[PDB]
Amino acid sequence: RLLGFDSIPAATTDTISLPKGYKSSVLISWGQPLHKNGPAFDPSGNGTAAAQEVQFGDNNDGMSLFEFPGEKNRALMAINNEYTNYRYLYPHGGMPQSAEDVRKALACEGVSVIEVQRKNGQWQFVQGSRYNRRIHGNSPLRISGPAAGHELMKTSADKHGKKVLGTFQNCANGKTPWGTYLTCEENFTDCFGSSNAQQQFDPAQKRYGVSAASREINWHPFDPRFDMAKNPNELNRHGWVVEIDPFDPQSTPVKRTALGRFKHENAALAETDDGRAVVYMGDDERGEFIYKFVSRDKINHRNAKANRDILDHGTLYVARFDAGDGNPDHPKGQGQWIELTHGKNGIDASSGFADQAEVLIHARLAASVVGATRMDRPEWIVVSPKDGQVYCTLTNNAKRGEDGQPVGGPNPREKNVYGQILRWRTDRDDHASKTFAWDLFVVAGNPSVHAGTPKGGSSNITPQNMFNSPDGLGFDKAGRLWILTDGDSSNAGDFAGMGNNQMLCADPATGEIRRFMVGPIGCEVTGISFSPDQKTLFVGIQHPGENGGSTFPEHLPNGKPRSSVMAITREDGGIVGAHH
Ligand code: VO4
Ligand SMILES: [Ca+2]
Ligand SMILES: [Ca+2]
Ligand SMILES: [Ca+2]
Ligand SMILES: [Cl-]
Numbered sequence: 001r002l003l004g005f006d007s008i009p010a011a012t013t014d015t016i017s018l019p020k021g022y023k024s025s026v027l028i029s030w031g032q033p034l035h036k037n038g039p040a041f042d043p044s045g046n047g048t049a050a051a052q053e054v055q056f057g058d059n060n061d062g063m064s065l066f067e068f069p070g071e072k073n074r075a076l077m078a079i080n081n082e083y084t085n086y087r088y089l090y091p092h093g094g095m096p097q098s099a100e101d102v103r104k105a106l107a108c109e110g111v112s113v114i115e116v117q118r119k120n121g122q123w124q125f126v127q128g129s130r131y132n133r134r135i136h137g138n139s140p141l142r143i144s145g146p147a148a149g150h151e152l153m154k155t156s157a158d159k160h161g162k163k164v165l166g167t168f169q170n171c172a173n174g175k176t177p178w179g180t181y182l183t184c185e186e187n188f189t190d191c192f193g194s195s196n197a198q199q200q201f202d203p204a205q206k207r208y209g210v211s212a213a214s215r216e217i218n219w220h221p222f223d224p225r226f227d228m229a230k231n232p233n234e235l236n237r238h239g240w241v242v243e244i245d246p247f248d249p250q251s252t253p254v255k256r257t258a259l260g261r262f263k264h265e266n267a268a269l270a271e272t273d274d275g276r277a278v279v280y281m282g283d284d285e286r287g288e289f290i291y292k293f294v295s296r297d298k299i300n301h302r303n304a305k306a307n308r309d310i311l312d313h314g315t316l317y318v319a320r321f322d323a324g325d326g327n328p329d330h331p332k333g334q335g336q337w338i339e340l341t342h343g344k345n346g347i348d349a350s351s352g353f354a355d356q357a358e359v360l361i362h363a364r365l366a367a368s369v370v371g372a373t374r375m376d377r378p379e380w381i382v383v384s385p386k387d388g389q390v391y392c393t394l395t396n397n398a399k400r401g402e403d404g405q406p407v408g409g410p411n412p413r414e415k416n417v418y419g420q421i422l423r424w425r426t427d428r429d430d431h432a433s434k435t436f437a438w439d440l441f442v443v444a445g446n447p448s449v450h451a452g453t454p455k456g457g458s459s460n461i462t463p464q465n466m467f468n469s470p471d472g473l474g475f476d477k478a479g480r481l482w483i484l485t486d487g488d489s490s491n492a493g494d495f496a497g498m499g500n501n502q503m504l505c506a507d508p509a510t511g512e513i514r515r516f517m518v519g520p521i522g523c524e525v526t527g528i529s530f531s532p533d534q535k536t537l538f539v540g541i542q543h544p545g546e547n548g549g550s551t552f553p554e555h556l557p558n559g560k561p562r563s564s565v566m567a568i569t570r571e572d573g574g575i576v577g578a579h580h
C-alpha cells in the first residue's frame with residue numbers, strides 16, 4: 001500500500017519526532033544570510049533592516065522546489081515568509097518604534113529564493129548562489145491583469161496603478177507548469193491602520209476586515225503607505241496571487257489580478273481537458289469562499305515563455321456546495337462553480353460593480369451576490385496527481401452556527417474547533433466542468449474526549465492518529481496525501497492527546513491516516529516540497545516558541561527559537577513515506 005511507516009505517538013517535546021528509520025536536519029533558518037560575505041544572524045535582535053532584506057525571512061510557510069535542467073544534484077526552492085514575531089525580531093521585543101523597525105518587519109516577509117545542492121544524498125543550502133534572492137515587503141513589483149491601471153489601484157506614489165511596493169503576509173503557494181512560482185497574500189489587511197482612529201470604512205473595506213488600529217502590526221505610524229487616511233487605495237494593491245520566476249534573480253514579480261483579491265492561502269494548479277490552466281484557491285477567513293480560475297488560453301507545455309501572461313486572461317468562479325446527504329460520518333453531495341463576471345449572475349451596476357476590475361478587487365462582495373457557500377476557513381488545496389480529485393482543508397470555524405453561517409453540507413458542526421478535509425471530484429474528471437461531487441474526506445475530532453458524538457470526528461479518526469486544524473496539504477508522486485496542522489497545541493480539554501502540531505500521511509483511496517511527524521513547542525507545521533527523487537521531504541517549522549516555550553532548533557541556553565525549513569530523509573536512503 002501507500003503508507004509504509006507505523007503511526008507515531010503524539011508528542012509535546014521541543015523537538016522533531018519521526019517514525020523509526022527517519023531523520024531530520026535544518027536546511028535553513030530565519031536570519032540566514034543568502035549572499036557571499038552576508039551579515040550573520042544576530043540572536044540579540046540588533047540586526048538591521050538592511051541585513052534582514054538579504055537574510056532568509058521569518059516564519060517560513062508555503063514553498064515549492066524547482067529542478068535545474070541537466071543537473072539532478074541542484075534545485076531551487078521558493079519559500080514564503082509570512083509574518084514576524086516581534087518578541088524575537090527586535091531587541092526591545094515589542095511593537096515597532098520607528099521607520100527602521102517597520103522596514104525590518106517588512107524585510108522579514110515575502111519570499112526567499114534559494115539554491116540547494118545534493119551531496120551524499122543530503123540536500124544543503126548554497127550560500128552565495130546567483131539565484132539566491134529576497135523579495136520582501138518593500139520590493140518593486142508589477143500589477144498585471146484586468147485590474148492593473150484601474151482608478152482603485154492608483155495612489156499618490158503610483159499614479160498609473162501598475163507599480164506596487166512589496167508582497168507581504170505570504171501564506172502558501174502554487175507551482176506552474178511553465179516554470180514559475182505563485183505566492184499568496186493572505187492576512188494583508190492586518191498591516192493597515194489609520195492615523196484617523198474614527199475613520200469610517202466603506203462596505204468593501206469592512207468586508208475585508210480592515211481597522212484603524214491594525215491587527216497588532218502597527219506599521220502605519222511610521223510608514224504612511226499603510227495609513228488608510230492618506231493612501232486608502234494601497235489596501236487594493238495587496239491580497240493577490242503573485243507570480244515569481246525563480247530562475248531569473250533580476251525579474252520583477254507580477255501580481256495577477258485575474259485571480260481575484262482576497263486572503264489567499266494557496267494556489268492549486270490543474271488543467272482542463274481542452275488544455276487551459278486551472279487554479280483552485282481558498283480564502284482563509286471564517287465564512288469565506290473557495291474560488292477557481294480558468295485561463296482563456298491553452299498551456300504551451302513545451303514553450304514555457306509562451307505562457308508568460310497566461311494568468312492575465314480567463315474566468316474567475318466561486319463555489320456553492322449543496323446540503324449533501326446528511327450522513328454523520330461521510331457526508332457527500334454536489335456543488336457548482338458560479339462565474340464572477342460583470343454582466344452575469346446579478347453582478348452589475350445595480351449590485352455595486354461598474355466593471356470587471358471592481359469585481360476582481362472586491363471578489364468577496366461579488367461572490368456574496370452570486371450566493372457562494374460560506375465555508376469553515378478554507379486553507380490549502382491540492383490536486384491528486386493520480387486521479388485529479390481536489391482536497392481542501394477547512395481548518396475550523398468557532399462561529400459556525402451563528403446567524404448567517406448555518407450548519408450543513410461540508411460544514412457539519414456548530415462551534416467547529418477541529419476542522420475537516422473537503423474533497424471534490426470534477427464532473428467527467430474534466431477540470432473545465434462547472435459541477436462536481438463533494439465529500440468530507442475526514443472530519444477531525446477527539447474520540448478520547450467526545451466518543452460517539454460529532455466532536456469525536458469521522459471513523460477514520462482514532463485516539464492514535466487524532467489531530468486538529470488541518471491546514472497545509474501536499475501530494476507526493478506516489479499519491480500519498482500529506483496533512484500539516486496549525487491547531488491548538490494545549491494537549492488539554494478538547495485537544496487532549498493531540499500534543500504539538502504535526503504532519504500526517506493519508507491514503508486518499510481508503511481514508512486511512514497515520515501520524516508521521518510532531519513538531520517543536522509553539523510551532524505550526526507548514527510548507528511542503530519533495531526532492532525530485534522523493535527521498536527528501538522538505539517541511540517548514542513556523543514560529544517555534546510563539547508563546548516563549550522553545551529554543552528550537554539550536555537549543556542554546558535560554559536561546560532564541562528560529563523558524564526553519566527541515567529536510568526529512570530515511571536512514572536507508574529510500575522514498576519518504578514508502579515501505580522499507
Ligand atoms: O496564517 V494562518 O491562517 O495558518 O494562521
Ligand atoms: Ca496556513
Ligand atoms: Ca491556519
Ligand atoms: Ca497559522
Ligand atoms: Cl450547489
Ligand SMILES: [Cl-]
Binds near residue numbers: 523545547549
Ligand atoms: Cl511557545
